[PDB]
Design a protein around this ligand. Structure first.
Ligand SMILES: Nc1nc2c(ncn2[C@@H]2O[C@H](COP(=O)(O)OP(=O)(O)O)[C@@H](O)[C@H]2O)c(=O)[nH]1
Ligand SMILES: [Mg+2]
Length: 170
Protein backbone atom coordinates (compact mmCIF):
# COMPACT_ATOMS: atom_id res chain seq x y z
CA UNK A 1 0.00 0.00 0.00
CA UNK A 2 -0.60 2.67 -1.47
CA UNK A 3 -2.69 5.05 0.40
CA UNK A 4 -4.76 7.98 -0.66
CA UNK A 5 -3.55 11.34 0.73
CA UNK A 6 -6.27 13.77 1.94
CA UNK A 7 -5.59 17.31 3.10
CA UNK A 8 -7.86 18.68 5.74
CA UNK A 9 -7.70 22.30 6.92
CA UNK A 10 -9.06 23.23 10.31
CA UNK A 11 -10.39 26.74 11.01
CA UNK A 12 -12.38 28.51 13.69
CA UNK A 13 -12.11 31.15 16.39
CA UNK A 14 -9.25 31.23 18.89
CA UNK A 15 -9.78 29.04 21.91
CA UNK A 16 -12.41 26.81 20.44
CA UNK A 17 -10.18 23.74 20.78
CA UNK A 18 -8.69 23.24 17.25
CA UNK A 19 -5.22 22.36 18.46
CA UNK A 20 -6.45 20.07 21.24
CA UNK A 21 -8.89 18.41 18.72
CA UNK A 22 -6.01 17.57 16.34
CA UNK A 23 -3.57 16.42 19.04
CA UNK A 24 -6.18 14.36 20.85
CA UNK A 25 -7.12 12.57 17.64
CA UNK A 26 -3.60 11.96 16.27
CA UNK A 27 -1.77 11.05 19.50
CA UNK A 28 -4.82 9.67 21.41
CA UNK A 29 -4.08 11.84 24.41
CA UNK A 30 -5.58 15.23 25.30
CA UNK A 31 -2.62 17.56 25.88
CA UNK A 32 -1.92 18.85 29.37
CA UNK A 33 1.11 20.88 28.12
CA UNK A 34 1.90 23.96 26.07
CA UNK A 35 1.90 23.33 22.27
CA UNK A 36 4.18 25.68 20.24
CA UNK A 37 3.58 27.44 16.91
CA UNK A 38 6.26 24.85 15.92
CA UNK A 39 3.53 22.35 15.06
CA UNK A 40 1.03 23.71 12.54
CA UNK A 41 0.13 20.32 11.02
CA UNK A 42 -0.45 16.79 12.25
CA UNK A 43 -0.93 13.47 10.44
CA UNK A 44 -2.71 10.18 10.86
CA UNK A 45 -2.89 7.01 8.81
CA UNK A 46 -6.42 5.62 9.17
CA UNK A 47 -8.61 2.95 7.62
CA UNK A 48 -11.98 4.34 6.50
CA UNK A 49 -14.56 2.05 4.79
CA UNK A 50 -11.81 -0.49 4.09
CA UNK A 51 -9.57 2.21 2.51
CA UNK A 52 -6.07 3.19 3.83
CA UNK A 53 -5.75 6.94 4.00
CA UNK A 54 -3.09 9.46 4.99
CA UNK A 55 -4.96 12.35 6.54
CA UNK A 56 -2.98 15.57 6.71
CA UNK A 57 -4.41 18.03 9.21
CA UNK A 58 -3.55 21.72 9.08
CA UNK A 59 -3.94 23.88 12.16
CA UNK A 60 -4.28 27.49 11.10
CA UNK A 61 -4.65 29.87 14.15
CA UNK A 62 -5.63 22.87 -1.92
CA UNK A 63 -7.59 21.55 1.07
CA UNK A 64 -9.71 18.52 0.05
CA UNK A 65 -12.01 19.22 3.04
CA UNK A 66 -12.40 21.93 5.70
CA UNK A 67 -13.41 21.58 9.34
CA UNK A 68 -15.01 24.74 10.62
CA UNK A 69 -15.00 24.56 14.43
CA UNK A 70 -16.89 26.54 17.10
CA UNK A 71 -17.19 25.83 20.78
CA UNK A 72 -20.56 24.49 22.00
CA UNK A 73 -20.23 26.84 24.99
CA UNK A 74 -19.31 29.97 23.06
CA UNK A 75 -22.25 31.53 21.19
CA UNK A 76 -19.82 34.16 19.84
CA UNK A 77 -17.67 31.46 18.16
CA UNK A 78 -20.85 29.93 16.72
CA UNK A 79 -22.00 33.17 15.12
CA UNK A 80 -18.56 33.50 13.50
CA UNK A 81 -19.10 30.25 11.72
CA UNK A 82 -21.42 32.16 9.32
CA UNK A 83 -20.07 35.64 9.74
CA UNK A 84 -16.37 34.83 9.17
CA UNK A 85 -15.31 31.25 8.61
CA UNK A 86 -17.82 30.16 5.96
CA UNK A 87 -17.17 33.21 3.80
CA UNK A 88 -13.36 32.98 4.20
CA UNK A 89 -13.35 29.30 3.13
CA UNK A 90 -15.71 29.92 0.25
CA UNK A 91 -13.76 32.87 -1.14
CA UNK A 92 -10.76 30.64 -1.54
CA UNK A 93 -12.66 27.45 -2.42
CA UNK A 94 -16.28 27.55 -3.76
CA UNK A 95 -16.80 23.79 -3.86
CA UNK A 96 -14.63 22.00 -1.27
CA UNK A 97 -16.74 20.19 1.39
CA UNK A 98 -17.05 21.72 4.81
CA UNK A 99 -17.74 19.70 8.00
CA UNK A 100 -19.13 21.84 10.83
CA UNK A 101 -17.73 20.77 14.20
CA UNK A 102 -19.13 21.74 17.62
CA UNK A 103 -16.30 21.33 20.15
CA UNK A 104 -16.12 20.91 23.92
CA UNK A 105 -19.23 18.70 23.93
CA UNK A 106 -18.24 17.63 27.50
CA UNK A 107 -19.14 21.08 28.72
CA UNK A 108 -22.53 21.52 27.03
CA UNK A 109 -24.15 19.67 30.02
CA UNK A 110 -21.67 20.95 32.53
CA UNK A 111 -23.48 22.61 35.43
CA UNK A 112 -20.91 25.37 36.07
CA UNK A 113 -20.35 26.15 32.37
CA UNK A 114 -24.17 26.39 32.02
CA UNK A 115 -24.39 28.71 35.08
CA UNK A 116 -21.45 30.89 33.90
CA UNK A 117 -23.07 31.43 30.60
CA UNK A 118 -26.36 32.10 32.24
CA UNK A 119 -24.89 35.03 34.24
CA UNK A 120 -23.95 36.83 30.92
CA UNK A 121 -27.48 35.95 29.60
CA UNK A 122 -26.00 33.06 27.36
CA UNK A 123 -26.72 29.30 26.76
CA UNK A 124 -24.80 26.44 25.10
CA UNK A 125 -25.49 25.71 21.46
CA UNK A 126 -27.93 22.78 21.03
CA UNK A 127 -27.70 20.00 18.54
CA UNK A 128 -30.67 21.35 16.43
CA UNK A 129 -29.10 24.77 16.38
CA UNK A 130 -25.78 23.37 15.21
CA UNK A 131 -27.58 21.30 12.51
CA UNK A 132 -29.44 24.40 11.32
CA UNK A 133 -26.11 26.31 11.13
CA UNK A 134 -24.61 23.48 9.04
CA UNK A 135 -27.53 23.82 6.61
CA UNK A 136 -27.13 27.60 6.55
CA UNK A 137 -23.43 27.30 5.45
CA UNK A 138 -23.99 24.26 3.26
CA UNK A 139 -21.84 21.94 5.33
CA UNK A 140 -22.02 18.31 4.33
CA UNK A 141 -22.13 17.17 7.91
CA UNK A 142 -22.59 18.54 11.45
CA UNK A 143 -20.71 16.79 14.19
CA UNK A 144 -20.13 17.44 17.89
CA UNK A 145 -17.10 16.19 19.87
CA UNK A 146 -14.95 16.53 22.96
CA UNK A 147 -11.19 16.42 22.55
CA UNK A 148 -10.95 15.96 26.33
CA UNK A 149 -13.11 12.79 26.56
CA UNK A 150 -12.76 11.83 22.91
CA UNK A 151 -16.53 11.48 22.64
CA UNK A 152 -17.38 11.95 18.93
CA UNK A 153 -13.76 12.54 17.99
CA UNK A 154 -13.06 9.70 15.51
CA UNK A 155 -16.35 10.37 13.68
CA UNK A 156 -15.25 13.94 12.84
CA UNK A 157 -12.29 12.62 10.82
CA UNK A 158 -14.04 9.59 9.40
CA UNK A 159 -16.69 11.96 8.04
CA UNK A 160 -14.10 14.44 6.77
CA UNK A 161 -12.56 11.52 4.86
CA UNK A 162 -15.96 10.22 3.56
CA UNK A 163 -16.71 13.72 2.33
CA UNK A 164 -13.71 13.41 0.02
CA UNK A 165 -13.86 9.75 -0.96
CA UNK A 166 -17.67 9.98 -1.61
CA UNK A 167 -18.73 13.29 -3.04
CA UNK A 168 -22.49 13.69 -3.60
CA UNK A 169 -24.05 12.97 -7.01
CA UNK A 170 -25.66 16.47 -6.86
N1 LIG B 1 -13.42 21.00 28.59
C1 LIG B 1 -12.88 20.99 27.36
N2 LIG B 1 -11.84 21.85 27.13
C2 LIG B 1 -11.22 21.82 25.92
C3 LIG B 1 -11.52 20.85 24.94
N3 LIG B 1 -10.70 21.04 23.88
C4 LIG B 1 -9.87 22.08 24.22
N4 LIG B 1 -10.19 22.56 25.45
C5 LIG B 1 -9.57 23.70 26.14
O1 LIG B 1 -9.88 24.89 25.41
C6 LIG B 1 -8.76 25.79 25.50
C7 LIG B 1 -8.25 26.11 24.07
O2 LIG B 1 -7.89 24.93 23.35
P1 LIG B 1 -6.95 25.07 22.00
O3 LIG B 1 -6.93 23.68 21.45
O4 LIG B 1 -5.64 25.75 22.37
O5 LIG B 1 -7.88 26.07 21.12
P2 LIG B 1 -7.46 26.77 19.70
O6 LIG B 1 -7.07 28.19 20.00
O7 LIG B 1 -8.75 26.66 18.90
O8 LIG B 1 -6.31 25.89 19.16
C8 LIG B 1 -7.67 25.10 26.27
O9 LIG B 1 -7.61 25.55 27.62
C9 LIG B 1 -8.03 23.66 26.16
O10 LIG B 1 -7.55 22.91 27.24
C10 LIG B 1 -12.54 19.96 25.21
O11 LIG B 1 -12.85 19.11 24.38
N5 LIG B 1 -13.21 20.03 26.43
MG1 LIG C 1 -4.50 26.38 18.47
Amino acid sequence: GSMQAIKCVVVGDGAVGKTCLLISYTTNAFPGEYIPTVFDNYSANVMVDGKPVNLGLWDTAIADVFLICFSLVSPASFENVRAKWYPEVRHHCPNTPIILVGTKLDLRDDKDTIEKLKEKKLTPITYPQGLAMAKEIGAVKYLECSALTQRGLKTVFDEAIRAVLCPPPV
